[PDB]
Amino acid sequence: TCRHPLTDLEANEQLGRCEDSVKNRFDRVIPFLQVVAGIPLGLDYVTRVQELAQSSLGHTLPEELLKDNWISGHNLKGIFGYATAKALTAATEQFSASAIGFFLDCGFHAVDISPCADGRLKGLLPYILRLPLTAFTYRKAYAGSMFDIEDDLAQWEKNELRRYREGVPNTADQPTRYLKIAVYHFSTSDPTHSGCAAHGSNDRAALEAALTQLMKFREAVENAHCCGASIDILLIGVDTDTDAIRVHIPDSKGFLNPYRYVDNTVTYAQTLHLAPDEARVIIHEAILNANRSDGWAKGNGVASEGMRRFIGQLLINNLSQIDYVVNRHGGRYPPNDIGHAERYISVGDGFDEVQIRNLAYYAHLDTVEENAIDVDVGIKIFTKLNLSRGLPIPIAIHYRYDPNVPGSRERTVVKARRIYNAIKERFSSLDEQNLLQFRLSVQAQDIGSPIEEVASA
């Protein structure tokens, strides 16, 4: 078990430290609750619980959570909800140009990544791809990578208008394109149970669904606008057991083949014992041989220089993540980490500060009526994850708003409260048992904006 020459050691250590700290903050709540349940409800109950909470979780608890526990029993569910919300707040607060130039040199003025809403793909940008979130990098996760065409088209139009009017990334005459990346996931160890649940854990079904959505988006962009407007499409598959990516190389015209791809597992295997420059040569030629391969991978021409450079950089970055997983877990995630191990249900736009693998179940929705199935899937997952142990389900309803648009924050807060009430009236049996805990938050759309808590009522 040696180290790859291209591994980013200090970045790996930093990422591991952040992951460990956040997961520990979320996980230490349960032992504290178990200790609390053994404290008699005497006259010293409140003081003892408060000092124990200060010693364990680093914060105290509101007296309303403990004031009437002597007559109403231990308020373990309320303490759990409060502690989970505090852990999420602490994680976000603790988290809180070169990428644009690199994208421009590769021939793109904007990169749009649409991975699956699976929790195992949450850390796709900071861990698997090592791509920072910039003003021109977007991450819109959907269930089964089934991203919506209309909003992507609107984003494309907005970016093109910005290029035409101000040329913020670059002037409109530059021959750069809009890059849309679709990410599917699969499990090598358990293909039939640990795959994409949106497609019945069928690897090829997820692959073809993502490819079809990419093709539909490209054709919609072509149809909606004239003068030969077009976009570039990229397809990436992630093995959730080893966090290794296979990138489907487009041909000269940009079409993607489900069989023409570069797999980073064999690349890591065959570049382990070489030297940095030689490994870079290896991946540079390997992209070419994969793109020029025949048979089922028959492709017309070869991909552009920018495409190949971008894919090579992606593979080099993913090598560090493969090495990170090998170091931390001996080459494969533990059996508990292979499946669902989420700590809370994220509803709305999600958090850009806690992009950690298998931390939360994300349900991209603006209305419960439109995407109820995501909420039901999350509740079903947490029924086994949490309700089996008797713990309540924590739900963070987070939304982003644009401060430039007048009245946007109030509308966003109203939307958050509406979502909270809709999730309340559904699963009303779980509500009556206090098995659902909520926290509502809003944030400005700018990167690094503070997160503001809002009252549930």
Q: Regarding beta strands 436-444 and 451-454, do their DSSP bridges make them parallel or antiparallel, or are they unpaired?
A: antiparallel
Cα distance between residue 61 and residue 356, in whole Å: 27
Q: What is the total residue count of the chain?
A: 457
Binding piece for a second copy, criterion CB under 8 A, among 2-10, 32-40, 47-55, 244-252: 32-40
Question: Is 203 designated active site?
Answer: no
Among 1, 2, 10, 42, binds a second copy (CB under 8 A): 42
Q: Is 429 in the site for a second copy (CB under 8 A)?
A: no
The secondary structure of residue 350, as a DSSP letter, is: -
Query: In terms of DSSP H, where are the helices of 193-249?
Result: 203-224
Q: Is 196 in the site for Zn ion (CB under 5 A)?
A: yes
Q: Is 76 in the site for a second copy (CB under 8 A)?
A: yes
196 binds, among Zn ion, a second copy, none (CB under 5 to 8 A by kind): Zn ion
Considering only CA atoms, which of 384, 398, 318 is closest in space to residue 354?
398
- In the block, residue with structure tokens 């208008």: 161
Residue 20 or 27 having the CB closest to a second copy: 27
Contact letters (x/-) for a second copy, 46-75, by CB under 8 A?
A: ---------------------xx-xxxx--
Cα distance between residue 374 and residue 198, in whole Å: 10
Residue 63 or 105 having the CB closest to a second copy: 63
Cβ atoms 302, 289 nearer than 8 A:
no
DSSP string, 64-119: GGTTTHHHH---HHHHHHHHHHHHHHHHHHHH--HHHHHHHHTTEEEEEEEEBS-G
Among 6, 15, 198, 214, binds Zn ion (CB under 5 A): 198
Q: Which residue in the list 44, 105, 112, 118 is annotated as catalytic?
A: 118
198 binds, among Zn ion, a second copy, none (CB under 5 to 8 A by kind): Zn ion
Binding-site positions read 116, 185, 196
Contact letters (x/-) for a second copy, 368-397, by CB under 8 A?
A: ---------------------xxx------
Q: Is 135 in the site for a second copy (CB under 8 A)?
A: no
Q: Is 272 in the site for a second copy (CB under 8 A)?
A: no
Q: What residues have CB less than 8 Å from 406, skipping those under 6 apart?
A: none
Query: In terms of DSSP H, where are the helices of 330-407?
Result: 335-338, 372-385
Q: Is 40 in the site for a second copy (CB under 8 A)?
A: yes
Binding piece for a second copy, criterion CB under 8 A, among 37-45, 110-118, 184-192, 282-290: 37-45
Binding-site positions for Zn(2+) read 116, 185, 196
Binding piece for a second copy, criterion CB under 8 A, among 42-50, 55-63, 158-166, 375-383: 42-50
Q: Is 118 in the site for Zn ion (CB under 5 A)?
A: yes
Coil/strand/helix, residue 37: coil
Residue 156 corresponds to which tokens in the numbers above?
A: 């494309």
With b for 16 or more beta-carbon neighbours within 10 A and e for fewer, the 166-189 pattern comes to: eeebeeeeeebbbbbbbbbbbbee
HSE, side-chain direction, 13 A CA sphere, residue 444:
9
138 binds, among a second copy, Zn ion, none (CB under 5 to 8 A by kind): none
Considering only CA atoms, which of 140, 67, 164, 84 is closest in space to residue 349?
140
Residue 40 or 335 having the CB closest to a second copy: 40
Smallest distance from a second copy to CB 386, Å: 11
Residue 205 corresponds to which tokens in the numbers above?
A: 């079904």
Residue 45 or 427 having the CB closest to a second copy: 45
Smallest distance from Zn ion to CB 410, Å: 34
Among 11, 28, 41, 408, binds a second copy (CB under 8 A): 41
Q: Is 27 in the site for a second copy (CB under 8 A)?
A: no
Coil/strand/helix, residue 408: helix
Angstrom distances, CA of residue 199 to CA of 147, 335, 419? 14, 22, 26
Q: What residues have CB less than 8 Å from 225, skipping those under 6 apart?
A: none
Among 116, 221, 236, 262, binds Zn ion (CB under 5 A): 116
Catalytic residues: 118
Using CB under 5 A as the criterion, which residues of the chain lie in contact with Zn ion when the complex forms? 116, 118, 196, 198
Q: Which residue ranges make up the site for a second copy (CB under 8 A)?
A: 33-35, 37-38, 40-43, 45, 67-68, 70-73, 76-77, 389-391
